[PDB]
Design a protein around this ligand. Structure first.
Ligand SMILES: [Zn+2]
Lengths: 21, 30, 30, 21, 30, 21
């Protein structure tokens, strides 16, 4: 998931935003 | 904005900034 | 509570939270 | 010691508590 | 003072402390 | 540069000070 993607690869702030409430 | 390499607590710091008062869910793979 | 992987400054952040006003000693191997 | 254990392996908050004053 | 191993955001935390109100430039290689 | 040196090797606070304004 996002936690793993951001650490093993890279991620954008827009991808992170999918986890906002 | 730029792409990010975020591990551990750095991920939650980033979520905090991106989401602000909206809040967020931190959901690692189990 | 869960187990932790803590390196560098993250260790001292954890000690700060665990100990609070009790304070703590940070003592790396030399 | 604890600093090395937490970084090379894992450690618990209870193990960390041994370092409180 | 001691030498430092600083990656990612830890570098900017260190610059913040060293420079204080002087401010600083964070300039990674491109 | 300094960003890379501090991460791949080590750096001093005095080396960092060269980046203060
Ligand atoms: Zn870190």
């Amino acid at each position: 998931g996002i936690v793993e993607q951001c650490c093993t690869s890279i991620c954008s702030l827009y991808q992170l935003e999918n986890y906002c409430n | 904005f730029v792409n990010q390499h975020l591990c551990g607590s750095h991920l939650v710091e980033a979520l905090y900034l991106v989401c602000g008062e909206r809040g967020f869910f931190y959901t690692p793979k189990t």
